[PDB]
Amino acid sequence: SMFLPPPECPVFEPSWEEFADPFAFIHKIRPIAEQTGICKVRPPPDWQPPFACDVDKLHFTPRIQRLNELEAQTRVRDYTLRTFGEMADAFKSDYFNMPVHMVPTELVEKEFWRLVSTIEEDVTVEYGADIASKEFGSGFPVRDSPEEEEYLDSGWNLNNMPVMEQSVLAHITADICGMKLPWLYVGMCFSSFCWHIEDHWSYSINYLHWGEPKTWYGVPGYAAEQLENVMKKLAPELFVSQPDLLHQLVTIMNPNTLMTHEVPVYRTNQCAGEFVITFPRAYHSGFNQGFNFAEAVNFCTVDWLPLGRQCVEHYRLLHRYCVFSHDEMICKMASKADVLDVVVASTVQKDMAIMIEDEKALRETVRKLGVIDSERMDFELLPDDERQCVKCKTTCFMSAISCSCKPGLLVCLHHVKELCSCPPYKYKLRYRYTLDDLYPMMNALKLRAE
Ligand SMILES: O=C(O)CNC(=O)C(=O)O
Numbered sequence: 040s041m042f043l044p045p046p047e048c049p050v051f052e053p054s055w056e057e058f059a060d061p062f063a064f065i066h067k068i069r070p071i072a073e074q075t076g077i078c079k080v081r082p083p084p085d086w087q088p089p090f091a092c093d094v095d096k097l098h099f100t101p102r103i104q105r106l107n108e109l110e111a112q113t114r115v116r117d118y119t120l121r122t123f124g125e126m127a128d129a130f131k132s133d134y135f136n137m138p139v140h141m142v143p144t145e146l147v148e149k150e151f152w153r154l155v156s157t158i159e160e161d162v163t164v165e166y167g168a169d170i171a172s173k174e175f176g177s178g179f180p181v182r183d184s185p186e187e188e189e190y191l192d193s194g195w196n197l198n199n200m201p202v203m204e205q206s207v208l209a210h211i212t213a214d215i216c217g218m219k220l221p222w223l224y225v226g227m228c229f230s231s232f233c234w235h236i237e238d239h240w241s242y243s244i245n246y247l248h249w250g251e252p253k254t255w256y257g258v259p260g261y262a263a264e265q266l267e268n269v270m271k272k273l274a275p276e277l278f279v280s281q282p283d284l285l286h287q288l289v290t291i292m293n294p295n296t297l298m299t300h301e302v303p304v305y306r307t308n309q310c311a312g313e314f315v316i317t318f319p320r321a322y323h324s325g326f327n328q329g330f331n332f333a334e335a336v337n338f339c340t341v342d343w344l345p346l347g348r349q350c351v352e353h354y355r356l357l358h359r360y361c362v363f364s365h366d367e368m369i370c371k372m373a374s375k376a377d378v379l380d381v382v383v384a385s386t387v388q389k390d391m392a393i394m395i396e397d398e399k400a401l402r403e404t405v406r407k408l409g410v411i412d413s414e415r416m417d418f419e420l421l422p423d424d425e426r427q428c429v430k431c432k433t434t435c436f437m438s439a440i441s442c443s444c445k446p447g448l449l450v451c452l453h454h455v456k457e458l459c460s461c462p463p464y465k466y467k468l469r470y471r472y473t474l475d476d477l478y479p480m481m482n483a484l485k486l487r488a489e
């Protein structure tokens with residue numbers, strides 16, 4: 040009546056054979072898990088990476104969080120892990136007037152949703168979210184016995200997933216620190232993460248190292264726009280376009296609201312030693328049951344490539360900033376075709392064929408607008424902020440239009456009419472590759488793939 044919990048998401052318990060390769064496993068579960076957005080993976084019972092750290096030497100600056108449904112929050116003092124933990128336990132213990140392990144998870148969940156709905160209640164909490172630095176540090180072992188060395192090179196060690204052969208993000212040489220370095224999340228009771236999807240609609244994978252559970256809600260990829268439509272109606276303030284990457288607006292929203300509007304929603308409690316995986320464009324949110332320590336990272340498989348391209352197109356329509364150029368990633372991999380995995384090479388080839396055919400058509404269109412002059416340009420050398428379309432903010436790589444009347448400004452080939460009021464004959468087509476350069480790059484991939 041008050042809170043009706045969503046149905047449980049899938050839980051997987053892979054054998055050690057299945058667990059050996061994450062990407063094969065993730066590919067295996069995808070048909071199930073993509074229908075629910077999120078899933079939970081329990082490793083085999085003896086897969087137990089050692090957590091070790093000094094609670095007095097780990098220092099961080101907490102974010103403060105007000106707990107109000109539909110209120111705007113932006114997506115991205117000082118505590119030690121010890122002093123945070125003391126604050127966190129005391130908070131929950133006083134809130135419920137009980138010892139922490141006695142507080143049932145169903146009650147914290149019920150109470151979270153009551154609390155965020157009531158305006159008279161104005162509970163604020165704190166949490167930690169930051170990338171590993173020399174102060175933060177991964178919860179997994181890194182280089183700085185057979186078992187303790189095993190965890191160093193495990194695929195499920197989240198330092199390795201991004202820079203493994205099979206994250207297409209591995210091959211990016213651009214700075215994308217938010218997207219291949221793990222994030223560390225130090226939770227307390229009710230600290231929450233707002234509804235979101237990952238940058239470039241990537242996967243995320245999250246491991247709870249220790250402490251009390253993290254409660255998750257997830258929506259499958261196919262329902263993303265339904266969720267957004269429900270959200271736009273209840274909170275249009277969140278949909279006013281953002282002036283930069285560091286101003287993304289997100290919110291807490293009761294999954295029963297979504298379920299009322301027939302958006303499918305699933306839940307889980309992730310406990311210590313369990314993984315949650317979010318699939319491309321799968322909206323998720325949640326909150327911590329209490330004091331805990333999690334670590335998460337983005338990644339991209341071969342299954343993701345075409346969604347990556349759709350995502351960049353969707354960003355263009357919304358005028359949203361990109362973290363990296365997708366076309367630049369594809370060409371970088373083409374230029375390394377000899378050393379790519381052959382299934383990777385095969386999938387890159389297929390995305391590259393679409394890129395080339397779209398680029399060919401776009402160039403024909405701008406030639407017919409009267410843009411005649413052209414010059415090669417190494418777009419990858421420009422900082423990002425010097426190669427965004429004035430109009431749609433897309434990060435340019437394949438091509439752009441410039442005019443000497445506005446030095447340094449560019450539009451992509453969709454926005455040729457948006458640069459300035461000079462006639463198009465004054466413009467230059469700036470291009471990274473001729474069509475004749477591109478066909479042999481794609482062919483190198485074909486050869487690698489057999
Ligand atoms: O754990 C959190 O607090 C937030 N994590 C995520 O959004 C994720 O892992 O994709």
Ligand SMILES: [Mn+2]
Nearest residue numbers: 106154157160
């Ligand atoms: Mn409130």
Ligand SMILES: [Mn+2]
Nearest residue numbers: 236237243323
């Ligand atoms: Mn996330």
Ligand SMILES: [Zn+2]
Nearest residue numbers: 428431451454
């Ligand atoms: Zn544009």
Ligand SMILES: [Zn+2]
Nearest residue numbers: 442444459461
């Ligand atoms: Zn001009």
